[PDB]
Amino acid sequence: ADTIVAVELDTYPNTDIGDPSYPHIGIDIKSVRSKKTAKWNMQDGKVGTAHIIYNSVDKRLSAVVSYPNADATSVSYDVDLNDVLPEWVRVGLSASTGLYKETNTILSWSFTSKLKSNSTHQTDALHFMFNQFSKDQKDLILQGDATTGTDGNLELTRVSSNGSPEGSSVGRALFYAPVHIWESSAATVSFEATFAFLIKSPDSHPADGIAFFISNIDSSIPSGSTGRLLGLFPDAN
Amino acid sequence: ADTIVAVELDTYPNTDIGDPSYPHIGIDIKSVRSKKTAKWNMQDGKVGTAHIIYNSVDKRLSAVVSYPNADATSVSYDVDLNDVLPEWVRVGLSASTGLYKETNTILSWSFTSKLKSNSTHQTDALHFMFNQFSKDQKDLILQGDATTGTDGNLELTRVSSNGSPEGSSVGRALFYAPVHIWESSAATVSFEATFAFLIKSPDSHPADGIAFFISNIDSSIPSGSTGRLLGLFPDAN
Amino acid sequence: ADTIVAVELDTYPNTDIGDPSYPHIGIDIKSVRSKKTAKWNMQDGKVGTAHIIYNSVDKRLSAVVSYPNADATSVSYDVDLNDVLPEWVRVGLSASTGLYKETNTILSWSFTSKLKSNSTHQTDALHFMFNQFSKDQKDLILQGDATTGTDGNLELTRVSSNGSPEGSSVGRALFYAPVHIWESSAATVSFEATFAFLIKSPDSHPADGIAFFISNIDSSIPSGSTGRLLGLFPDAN
Amino acid sequence: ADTIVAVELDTYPNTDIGDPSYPHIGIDIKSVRSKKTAKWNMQDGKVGTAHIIYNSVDKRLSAVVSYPNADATSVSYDVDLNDVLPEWVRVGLSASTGLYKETNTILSWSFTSKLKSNSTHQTDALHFMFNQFSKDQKDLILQGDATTGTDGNLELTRVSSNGSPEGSSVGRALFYAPVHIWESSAATVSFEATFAFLIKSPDSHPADGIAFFISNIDSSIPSGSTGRLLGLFPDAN
Ligand SMILES: [Ca+2]
Ligand SMILES: [Ca+2]
Ligand SMILES: [Ca+2]
Ligand SMILES: [Ca+2]
Ligand SMILES: [Mn+2]
Ligand SMILES: [Mn+2]
Ligand SMILES: [Mn+2]
Ligand SMILES: [Mn+2]
């Protein structure tokens, strides 16, 4: 079916589905129940930034979130990754809301991936960055409450005119253009993703979170992937 | 209809359609009849390389072809470009054959474009390079005699098993993913394309040429765009 | 002697030395008396951004300054450049003050240059960006009132503790590491520079300006290059 | 004193100094006696390519050598690195010869490093690539038998006019410009180095090897760092 491997920004502790006691960031492998996690003191009204890294060589999944003047969080997961995801995949981001609400916003999106080896010493690459999210991307793959064109930012969840974010939405955005993290002569595969985030929230118990993931090409939003589930996980934790 | 603006590598002088007396390189604007040209001493059996540049600021279309130890060619055309092509376009390459034959091969494909201004000081980009053209690109947009998977190269024209290139083909390859050379807060737009080429040819009168171009999204191959026409120009010079 | 070719941000009209009637930006070739200019409505207290571009091919010197929501300025000068500057040069920035005062500040510094051709299809490059200007760069070449380590910015002119900029200073900062814009097999040379600027100023007649330039390696500050002169021009307009 | 941390290409098994029974690649930390190693089947007369990677986050030292059609080698060492090397360092390459001889040649040199975090979301970078090693680099830091200007390559060891490599030499080349792998707001530091190599050798027992390393700024060649030692290790294994 539809598979995914992503890094989640869980501001809402959902201990039910083995979700911890506090808002955190975790690496989900085909599962919402992160394989690893790290306490994450969210910052209401502040601009954040998250970074991911992984080597075909080292075979490790690391990510780090942060805000200025503030101390950061670190978490890593050891994963070959070649047996999980396909040679050819797609990249995107998302976040859901259901019982409560919250803004789920990214002002910037930078993406680069490289493939090497082939001792041919050529290398094959794709990189790219955003910041002014106009209306009608075209190279953008928006699905759900996802919207574009408000203030040159990309807002994934439902928010009202004044600024009355809704809680029943789920936003998913993926690049129209695929990626390649394989290659026969593949003896080195690298990719780095780093996007900005502005997470407000009236309620003192913000929800439900934000992430980043890869997935099929014919990938579609989960049906009841609202709130925790994350809008990437098909239901069954 | 279908529009295009490209840089042509015409190894075959077709003076009929105002084509010069010798194999050359020219900039075609909605027309095969280059606006500018420059004598180009082709090199049979040798690896070449072509480069293009253009600034939203300077508003000039420059390209330069070359081989090692050998002297290069230069040609430029002054063109705003914002009134010709759409905000959103697609990028590709191609070449045709009809009366005669020839290989029309590129071993490498590098592409970068940047958009700036918005005094926001963010910038929005996309870059990427190829060299090992596997079978079933996916991020590749092949149309016609275009093929992939022979020796980690991209061969656009029809060539037989042994190596008996055909003469009735036309190969066009474009990136699956669109590009953006607009932007409201657009006060600077840049893009650089550079790919490799291996042009053999038994006959002492090789044909018919190779190029590079942008075009619509629903762009389709010309019908009788074989040989000179170039497989980008819809017939009517 | 000491030569320079730079792009000046003249907020102070000094018509005496053929300086126009209003604060502007101009391209100085061995001379302060810009070869070209363009009205420039400075923005007190606002963050700016300036961009430069030039091709060995097109052989044109273009730059563009701007702030958000605000309209930009454009100016270009046609200059081969290979007869002016040396194969090997150095890059930097500066600004002076003498009769009046003003802050002359850059928060960010991005720099890339490429050399191509050699039909070898290799290319030789150097790029780099700054934003958090710590104390004791080392890769930084500071001379004069130039300082580093205040708020992760690079302030070139003299400013007091509270924030009482002085008017008798001149700040020049250049990369410790040289550059190369030559090459025998040189048939294409490219470089792009873009840095941020925060220009305050109590007085309603700010001074004296900011720029960007290349120069010798044994380059040294002008003696009376205070104010207009610019701290790059050796005196004699 | 003079410290170094590098990746060695040991084609000569020197079991005496705990050097294995076969030509290999190993990571030397202040010591020649690699912390890790991996059998490496060298290819006489063939073009090679080596790659290194390390994250401030993952804190792992990985490198991979290879030639076309041929199977590669992998080796990694877990090393924070912040307690070993200084905030500010220099980058280079080298190789020695003493009892026997061999060419120790690199045709290409690509280098990029990034510093992030500061939740400021700016990042500070430096990248660059070579391939045509002209005479008198200037941005190059050559020491010893190191030479430049033969065929647009960088040859570090002594070789005669015809092509009669010597065996008593040692070549070290480092970038004139320093690097920065620190930063207070440092919560992510990345760098990737990849250069080409052509290792000939008449004798069926080539020697002595090639590497890559960082070190002090006032770094100087070892005195008896000929052969194994490597010309980076000060003698005392
Ligand atoms: Ca949760
Ligand atoms: Ca023709
Ligand atoms: Ca003035
Ligand atoms: Ca040894
Ligand atoms: Mn969770
Ligand atoms: Mn023509
Ligand atoms: Mn002026
Ligand atoms: Mn060893």
Coordinates of N, CA and C in Angstrom, one line a residue, chain A residues 144-218:
Chain A
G144 N -5.2 18.7 0.4 CA -5.9 19.0 1.6 C -6.0 20.5 1.9
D145 N -6.1 20.7 3.2 CA -6.2 22.1 3.8 C -5.0 22.9 3.4
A146 N -4.1 22.3 2.7 CA -2.9 23.0 2.3 C -3.3 24.2 1.4
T147 N -2.6 25.3 1.7 CA -2.9 26.5 0.9 C -1.5 27.3 0.6
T148 N -1.6 28.2 -0.4 CA -0.4 28.9 -0.8 C -0.9 30.3 -1.3
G149 N -0.2 31.4 -0.8 CA -0.5 32.7 -1.2 C -1.3 33.4 0.0
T150 N -0.5 33.9 0.9 CA -1.1 34.6 2.1 C -0.2 35.8 2.5
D151 N 1.1 35.4 2.5 CA 2.2 36.4 2.9 C 3.5 35.8 2.4
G152 N 3.4 35.0 1.3 CA 4.6 34.5 0.7 C 5.1 33.3 1.6
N153 N 4.1 32.7 2.1 CA 4.5 31.5 3.0 C 3.6 30.4 2.6
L154 N 3.9 29.2 3.1 CA 3.1 28.0 2.8 C 2.4 27.5 4.1
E155 N 1.1 27.7 4.0 CA 0.3 27.3 5.2 C -0.5 26.0 4.8
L156 N -0.2 24.9 5.6 CA -0.7 23.6 5.3 C -2.1 23.3 5.9
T157 N -2.3 24.0 7.1 CA -3.6 23.7 7.8 C -4.6 24.9 7.5
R158 N -5.9 24.5 7.8 CA -7.0 25.5 7.7 C -6.9 26.5 8.8
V159 N -6.9 27.8 8.3 CA -6.9 29.0 9.1 C -7.9 30.0 8.5
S160 N -8.6 30.7 9.3 CA -9.6 31.6 8.9 C -9.0 33.0 8.5
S161 N -9.8 33.8 7.8 CA -9.5 35.1 7.3 C -8.8 36.0 8.4
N162 N -9.4 36.2 9.5 CA -8.8 37.0 10.6 C -7.5 36.3 11.0
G163 N -7.7 35.1 11.4 CA -6.6 34.2 11.8 C -7.1 33.3 12.9
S164 N -8.2 32.6 12.5 CA -8.8 31.6 13.4 C -8.7 30.2 12.8
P165 N -7.4 29.7 13.1 CA -7.1 28.4 12.6 C -8.2 27.4 13.1
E166 N -8.4 26.4 12.2 CA -9.4 25.4 12.4 C -8.7 24.2 13.1
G167 N -9.5 23.2 13.5 CA -8.8 22.0 14.1 C -9.1 20.7 13.4
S168 N -9.9 20.7 12.3 CA -10.3 19.5 11.7 C -9.6 19.2 10.4
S169 N -8.5 20.0 10.1 CA -7.8 19.9 8.8 C -6.5 19.0 8.9
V170 N -6.0 18.9 7.7 CA -4.8 18.1 7.5 C -4.1 18.6 6.2
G171 N -2.9 19.1 6.3 CA -2.2 19.6 5.1 C -1.0 18.8 4.7
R172 N -0.9 18.5 3.4 CA 0.2 17.7 2.8 C 0.7 18.4 1.5
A173 N 2.0 18.6 1.5 CA 2.6 19.3 0.3 C 3.8 18.5 -0.1
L174 N 3.8 18.1 -1.4 CA 5.0 17.3 -2.0 C 5.4 17.9 -3.3
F175 N 6.7 17.7 -3.6 CA 7.3 18.2 -4.8 C 6.7 17.4 -6.0
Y176 N 6.3 18.1 -7.0 CA 5.7 17.6 -8.3 C 6.8 16.6 -8.9
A177 N 8.0 17.0 -8.7 CA 9.2 16.3 -9.3 C 9.7 15.2 -8.3
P178 N 9.8 14.0 -8.8 CA 10.4 12.9 -8.0 C 11.9 13.1 -7.7
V179 N 12.4 12.1 -7.0 CA 13.8 12.1 -6.6 C 14.4 10.6 -6.8
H180 N 15.7 10.5 -6.7 CA 16.4 9.3 -6.9 C 17.5 9.1 -5.8
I181 N 17.3 8.0 -5.0 CA 18.2 7.7 -3.9 C 18.7 6.3 -4.1
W182 N 18.9 5.9 -5.3 CA 19.4 4.5 -5.7 C 20.6 4.6 -6.5
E183 N 20.6 3.9 -7.6 CA 21.7 3.9 -8.6 C 22.6 2.6 -8.4
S184 N 22.6 1.9 -9.5 CA 23.4 0.6 -9.6 C 24.8 0.9 -9.0
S185 N 25.5 1.9 -9.6 CA 26.8 2.2 -9.2 C 26.8 3.1 -8.0
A186 N 25.7 2.9 -7.2 CA 25.5 3.6 -6.0 C 26.3 3.1 -4.8
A187 N 27.2 4.0 -4.4 CA 28.1 3.7 -3.3 C 28.2 5.0 -2.4
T188 N 27.2 5.9 -2.6 CA 27.0 7.1 -1.9 C 25.8 7.9 -2.3
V189 N 24.9 8.1 -1.4 CA 23.6 8.8 -1.6 C 23.4 9.8 -0.4
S190 N 23.2 11.1 -0.8 CA 23.1 12.1 0.3 C 21.9 13.1 0.0
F191 N 21.2 13.5 1.1 CA 20.1 14.5 1.0 C 19.9 15.2 2.3
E192 N 19.7 16.6 2.1 CA 19.5 17.5 3.3 C 18.3 18.3 3.0
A193 N 17.4 18.3 4.0 CA 16.2 19.1 4.0 C 16.1 20.0 5.2
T194 N 15.7 21.3 5.0 CA 15.7 22.3 6.0 C 14.6 23.3 5.7
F195 N 13.5 23.4 6.5 CA 12.4 24.3 6.3 C 12.1 25.1 7.6
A196 N 11.5 26.3 7.4 CA 11.1 27.2 8.5 C 9.7 26.9 8.9
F197 N 9.5 27.3 10.2 CA 8.1 27.1 10.8 C 7.7 28.1 11.8
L198 N 6.5 28.6 11.7 CA 5.9 29.6 12.6 C 4.7 28.9 13.2
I199 N 4.8 28.5 14.5 CA 3.7 27.8 15.2 C 3.1 28.6 16.3
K200 N 2.0 29.3 16.0 CA 1.2 30.1 16.9 C 0.4 29.2 17.8
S201 N -0.9 29.6 18.0 CA -1.8 28.8 18.8 C -2.3 29.5 20.1
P202 N -3.6 29.8 20.0 CA -4.3 30.5 21.1 C -4.3 29.6 22.4
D203 N -4.9 28.4 22.2 CA -5.0 27.4 23.2 C -3.6 27.0 23.8
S204 N -3.5 26.8 25.1 CA -2.3 26.5 25.8 C -1.9 25.1 25.5
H205 N -2.7 24.4 24.8 CA -2.4 23.0 24.4 C -2.5 22.8 22.9
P206 N -1.5 23.4 22.2 CA -1.4 23.4 20.8 C -1.5 22.0 20.2
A207 N -1.9 21.9 18.9 CA -2.0 20.6 18.2 C -2.2 20.9 16.7
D208 N -1.8 19.9 16.0 CA -1.3 18.6 16.5 C 0.1 18.3 16.3
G209 N 0.8 19.1 15.4 CA 2.2 18.8 15.0 C 2.5 19.1 13.6
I210 N 3.7 18.9 13.2 CA 4.2 19.1 11.8 C 5.3 18.0 11.6
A211 N 5.6 17.7 10.3 CA 6.6 16.7 10.0 C 7.4 17.0 8.7
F212 N 7.8 15.9 8.1 CA 8.5 15.8 6.8 C 8.6 14.3 6.4
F213 N 8.4 14.0 5.1 CA 8.4 12.6 4.8 C 8.6 12.4 3.2
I214 N 8.9 11.2 3.0 CA 9.0 10.6 1.6 C 7.8 9.6 1.5
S215 N 7.6 9.1 0.3 CA 6.4 8.2 0.2 C 6.3 7.8 -1.3
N216 N 5.3 7.0 -1.6 CA 5.0 6.6 -2.9 C 4.8 7.8 -3.8
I217 N 4.6 7.5 -5.1 CA 4.3 8.6 -6.1 C 2.8 8.8 -6.1
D218 N 2.1 7.7 -6.1 CA 0.6 7.7 -6.0 C 0.2 7.8 -4.6

